[PDB]
Ligand binder design. Structure first.
Ligand code: HEC
Ligand code: HEC
Ligand code: HEC
Ligand code: HEC
Ligand code: HEC
Ligand code: HEC
Ligand code: HEC
Ligand code: HEC
Ligand code: HEC
Ligand code: HEC
Ligand SMILES: [Ca+2]
Ligand SMILES: [Ca+2]
Length: 605
């Protein structure tokens, strides 16, 4: 009813005719009786090297038959009324026009169970199953082609049904069997197509082979990614090489020699080297910062560089290697009151100060006890949350390989661990933004753990435990994105609302247009709806403001699409600063809306 579990009991080829017997149960192992529509496919696997030295294993797709109990069925389908079924193909494999059936080769039968309901009305989910067997005894074959696991693709896609063919196939093994030479066109074989669909994408985790190639119990042949080099497969990314013509490479007329030069150790290390280089550079320094508010409302910022063990070092040791040490200071971690530009409320803009640029100290920056010190302009310190000033800090070093090097004109650079510091004018404990609803760990599956956020026009920010100030239910440090509000203020970024700069909207906007984002749980462990109590209005266009719940939901929902309207609910859409802020705690949305990350559309009627 929710899950279909297929357990195969007998799978053989009898004089060229494939036959399969299997049992179907649901999630709680209850027999499923009365299945109505299923498609059966047959294939066989050419072993590694069989078509030529160095050639990969290769599926041969005999074809498929669709069985509808209420209509046509080419084969013989038997419902034994206890959860056990049998299907005997109409096909004889010896009669295949393109493939030479060989009863010594490993065989495979695949099943797609359609979502046709049982006769009593019970709903059936679309399902995939497959079995691998030797033709005569039906036992497990001695060779296979299980390289990638559906779980790896699901890290980004959640369900492979989303990517092609109207949701028919959710098991990657089903894709890899059909996507083979002789069935799809040249270039559509799976060892070529998936490379070509990702090699030109910016998403961070795709820069590593391990995003699809890792150890998995469902993928015994997973090591083939470095051990089976082939002209077609390696050339799927190296598309400008012509091995037959010897262009961009010595001439290779076949695959017989690739592995003699391209041993798996070398292939693995050279494709994992840049990521491993970046990790070795990032591990080399840390940062500890302090922020102390003064009587004249200025704030003293002290930044100490640490070594790999966490011990402070004299910042002059590494100064000539610092490309940019970037700091941003704001007030009010739970709702910043300094805009990116001057706020309509405080009249104050965030303090953006580089401490070091191209190895040179900047104005007002001094070395004291090997630490970096800078005094900010006067800040709009106030009561409550506005007693706390906070600074988000990025550090970009010049690097080569696994080492920090002095900065030159064309030097490569690496973003280091970002730092987040808090301070007060009163001297009481600082306030801090909530982090209990967005955990940066959920970002790393798509973006990797070396996400250099805003590398390019900024120093770059790598989010680690270095910015953590809370622990989760299991005592593990929470890495939050709360530092980002230093620039993503309620008043926007540089366009003062025209780009919906506020962090409450910014990630919804940029991800609302991405197909791989489909559920709130891809970033949310929870919703902190209480945080709206401490929010004012957000700038949703240049100089115009919107009550905070409405501003958040309208990141993705056009305001006019909300049928019940917003005037009756206490909200203001692109109004005056004071007007919108006056109505900020008048929104009635949560009297009816009870969103959870799993289903945020829940309403109390
Ligand atoms: C994150 C690092 C990903 C992993 C792991 C896998 N895929 Fe992917 N895929 C990803 C992105 C960002 C895109 C761009 C298209 C989009 O807007 O989503 C894709 C694209 C594809 C496609 C192209 C057709 C499509 O539906 O987009 C295919 C056929 C595809 N992906 C399949 C696929 C398979 C089989 C994977 C496991 C081997 C897999 N993807 C992993 C992101 C990521
Ligand atoms: C046979 C029953 C198939 C299975 C199972 C899967 N695919 Fe498929 N796909 C198939 C064909 C015949 C074609 C047309 C290509 C041709 O030879 O003319 C496709 C097409 C695609 C494409 C687009 C190809 C391109 O644009 O270059 C993609 C990206 C694709 N298929 C991906 C894909 C995935 C992710 C599958 C598992 C969910 C999958 N295919 C299964 C045949 C069959
Ligand atoms: C997979 C479903 C993702 C999750 C989980 C997260 N992000 Fe994402 N993000 C994803 C895609 C496909 C894109 C488009 C850009 C691309 O590389 O294709 C983005 C975009 C961003 C950006 C834009 C700037 C950039 O570097 O591209 C940022 C800053 C960003 N995402 C941050 C981010 C955060 C903080 C996440 C956890 C809360 C997160 N992403 C998760 C895919 C996915
Ligand atoms: C997901 C987007 C992938 C990324 C990232 C990388 N590879 Fe891949 N690879 C992927 C698929 C879906 C397949 C085909 C699996 C099948 O059953 O057909 C492959 C295959 C290979 C192979 C061939 C293995 C063989 O024929 O036995 C090799 C040698 C290979 N991949 C190498 C490789 C490298 C070096 C990568 C990083 C640079 C890499 N892959 C990334 C999917 C994905
Ligand atoms: C010894 C004579 C080799 C044989 C046989 C094969 N390869 Fe090769 N290859 C070899 C070297 C010394 C290099 C350069 C390595 C470097 O770090 O500079 C290469 C290069 C490649 C590449 C990358 C090409 C590029 O990036 O422009 C690929 C994709 C490649 N080789 C694949 C490959 C294949 C498929 C082979 C069998 C047909 C093969 N190599 C054989 C050395 C040798
Ligand atoms: C000031 C130095 C900033 C810091 C700190 C952060 N961001 Fe930023 N970001 C900044 C500007 C001026 C802009 C362009 C205008 C706009 O608001 O869109 C951005 C943009 C983004 C985006 C949108 C995609 C893009 O154009 O890059 C995203 C998704 C984004 N920023 C995310 C983000 C995160 C997660 C941050 C904390 C690690 C962060 N930004 C900090 C300026 C600044
Ligand atoms: C990652 C790309 C996200 C996706 C997917 C969704 N949300 Fe989100 N949300 C994200 C960030 C970075 C923030 C800001 C955190 C902060 O400190 O300000 C938010 C915030 C919200 C809120 C505010 C309440 C809170 O917990 O802070 C709400 C109510 C919210 N987001 C709703 C929401 C819904 C309904 C989503 C699915 C459609 C959803 N978010 C996805 C990042 C991401
Ligand atoms: C992008 C990350 C979104 C945010 C932020 C919010 N919603 Fe959403 N919503 C989103 C999608 C992609 C969908 C499904 C497609 C559709 O547009 O219907 C929804 C759906 C809803 C629904 C149910 C559909 C309906 O017609 O009522 C509701 C009731 C809903 N959304 C409400 C809602 C609220 C109250 C939000 C702020 C807390 C909110 N959404 C944010 C995308 C996104
Ligand atoms: C009870 C009277 C509600 C109040 C108060 C608010 N919302 Fe609502 N909303 C309610 C229901 C039962 C539905 C679903 C019916 C529909 O026509 O969609 C909605 C719908 C939304 C949506 C999605 C609209 C769509 O996608 O078609 C959004 C984005 C939304 N509601 C937001 C929202 C806001 C911002 C509110 C406070 C200003 C608010 N709702 C109050 C019920 C009720
Ligand atoms: C897609 C991703 C692929 C796949 C399928 C192959 N390679 Fe590799 N390769 C790829 C990239 C993006 C780079 C640049 C370095 C990196 O960022 O990882 C390389 C580099 C190489 C090199 C380095 C030397 C050179 O480029 O001349 C070699 C020798 C190389 N690639 C060979 C190679 C082999 C043998 C492959 C099949 C096992 C192969 N590549 C596949 C991206 C990709
Ligand atoms: Ca810290
Ligand atoms: Ca803006």
């Amino acid at each position: 009813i929710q899950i279909l579990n297929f357990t195969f009991d007998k799978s053989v080829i009898t004089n060229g005719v494939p036959s399969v017997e299997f049992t179907v149960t649901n999630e709680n192992d209850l027999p499923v009786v009365g299945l109505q529509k299923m498609r059966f496919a047959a294939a066989q696997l050419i072993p590694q090297g069989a078509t030529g030295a160095g050639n990969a294993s290769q599926w041969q797709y005999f074809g498929d038959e669709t069985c509808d109990v209420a209509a046509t069925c080419p084969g013989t389908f038997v419902d034994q009324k206890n959860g056990h079924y049998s299907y005997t193909f109409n096909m004889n494999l010896t009669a295949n026009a393109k493939i030479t059936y060989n009863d010594q080769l490993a065989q495979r039968v695949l099943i797609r169970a359609y979502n046709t309901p049982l006769p009593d009305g019970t709903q059936v989910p679309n399902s995939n199953a497959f079995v691998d067997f030797t033709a005569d005894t039906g036992a497990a074959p001695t060779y296979s082609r299980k390289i990638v696991a559906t779980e790896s693709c699901n890290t980004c896609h959640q369900d492979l049904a989303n990517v092609k063919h109207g949701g028919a196939y959710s098991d990657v093994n089903y894709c890899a069997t059909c996507h083979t030479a002789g069935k799809v066109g040249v270039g559509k074989e799976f060892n070529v197509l998936v490379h070509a669909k990702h090699k030109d994408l910016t998403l961070g985790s795709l820069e590593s082979c391990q995003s699809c190639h890792a150890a998995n119990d469902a993928a015994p042949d997973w090591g083939n990614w470095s051990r089976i080099p082939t002209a077609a497969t390696c050339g799927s990314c190296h598309s400008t090489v012509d091995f037959a013509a010897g262009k961009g490479h010595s001439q290779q007329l076949d695959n017989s020699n690739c592995i003699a030069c391209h041993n798996s150790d070398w292939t693995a290390e050279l494709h994992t080297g840049k990521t491993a280089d970046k990790k070795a550079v990032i591990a080399q320094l840390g940062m500890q910062a302090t922020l102390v508010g003064q009587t004249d409302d200025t704030a003293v910022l002290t930044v100490s560089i640490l070594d790999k063990d966490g011990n402070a070092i004299d910042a002059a040791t590494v100064q000539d290697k610092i490309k940019r040490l970037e700091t941003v200071t704001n007030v009010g971690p739970n709702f910043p009151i300094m805009g990116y530009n001057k706020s309509p409320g405080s009249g104050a803009a965030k303090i953006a100060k580089d401490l070091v640029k191209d190895g040179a100290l900047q104005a007002g920056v001094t070395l004291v006890d090997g630490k970096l010190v800078f005094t900010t302009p006067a800040l709009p310190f106030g009561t409550g949350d506005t007693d706390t000033a906070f600074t988000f800090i990025g550090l970009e070093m010049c690097s080569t390989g696994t080492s920090l090097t002095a900065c030159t004109v064309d030097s490569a650079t690496t973003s280091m661990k970002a730092e987040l510091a808090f301070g007060t004018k009163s001297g009481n404990a600082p306030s801090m933004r909530h982090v209990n609803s967005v955990n940066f760990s959920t970002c790393q599956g798509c973006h990797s753990d070396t996400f250099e956020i805003h590398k390019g026009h900024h120093s770059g920010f790598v989010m680690t435990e270095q910015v953590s100030h809370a622990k989760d239910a299991n005592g593990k440090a929470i890495v939050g994105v709360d530092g980002c509000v230093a620039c993503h203020t309620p008043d926007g970024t540089y366009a003062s609302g025209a780009n919906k700069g506020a962090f409450e909207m910014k990630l919804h906007v940029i991800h609302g247009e991405q197909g791989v984002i489909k559920e709130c749980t891809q970033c949310h462990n929870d919703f902190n709806l209480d945080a709206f109590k401490v929010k004012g209005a957000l700038a949703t266009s240049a100089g115009k403001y919107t009550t905070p719940i409405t501003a958040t939901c309208t990141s993705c929902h056009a305001p006019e699409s909300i049928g019940h309207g917003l005037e009756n609910m206490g909200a203001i859409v692109n109004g005056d600063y004071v007007q919108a802020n006056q109505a900020a705690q008048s929104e009635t949305c949560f009297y009816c809306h009870k969103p959870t990350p799993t289903d945020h559309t829940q309403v109390k009627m």
